[PDB]
């Protein structure tokens, strides 16, 4: 999950400069225009440590995936607006032939 959340950080690395060229190349375009129970008790205390490690990272993975989903909330809007920009920019650039 961690290496994939920082994979999503490299998604951010892609999306920012894509949208930076595509808030820009539209303008360049119009420039182009122109006793054992106690052993069981020990097993129980082993499990009492287990459930602590469980719950700690359970709450933490809740926060973790919420963070990645707001990161997705960024991606969706900016990538989709940039999807509109690529098709209008391509068709506008082609309609200025001749």
């Amino acid at each position: 999950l961690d290496e994939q959340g920082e994979q999503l950080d490299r998604v951010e690395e892609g999306m920012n400069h894509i949208n930076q060229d595509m808030k820009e190349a539209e303008k360049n375009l119009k420039d182009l225009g122109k006793a054992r129970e106690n052993e069981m008790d020990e097993n129980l205390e082993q499990v009492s440590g287990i459930i602590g490690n469980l719950r700690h990272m359970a709450l933490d993975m809740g926060n973790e995936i919420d963070t990645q989903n707001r990161q997705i909330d960024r991606i969706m809007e900016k990538a989709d607006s940039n999807k509109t920009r690529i098709d209008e920019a391509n068709q506008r650039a082609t309609k200025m032939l001749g």
Binding site: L54, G62, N69, K83
Partner: protein, 58 residues
């Protein structure tokens, strides 16, 4: 034992909160593919359009 039963059953419900997450996980894993696949062609063909464009206006 029953103290631990209550604690652990709270943690059954923490996993049920992870089940509450997992539909919100999987649908979003779907729709991000549902954009990336459609983004791929619009990304792909624009260099070809650029080639079509720049042969003329030197």
């Amino acid at each position: 034992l029953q103290q631990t039963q209550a604690q652990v059953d709270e943690v059954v419900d923490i996993m049920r909160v992870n089940v509450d997450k997992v539909l919100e996980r999987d649908q979003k894993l779907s729709e991000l593919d549902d954009r990336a696949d459609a983004l791929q062609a619009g990304a792909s063909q624009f260099e070809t359009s650029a080639a079509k464009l720049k042969r003329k206006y030197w």
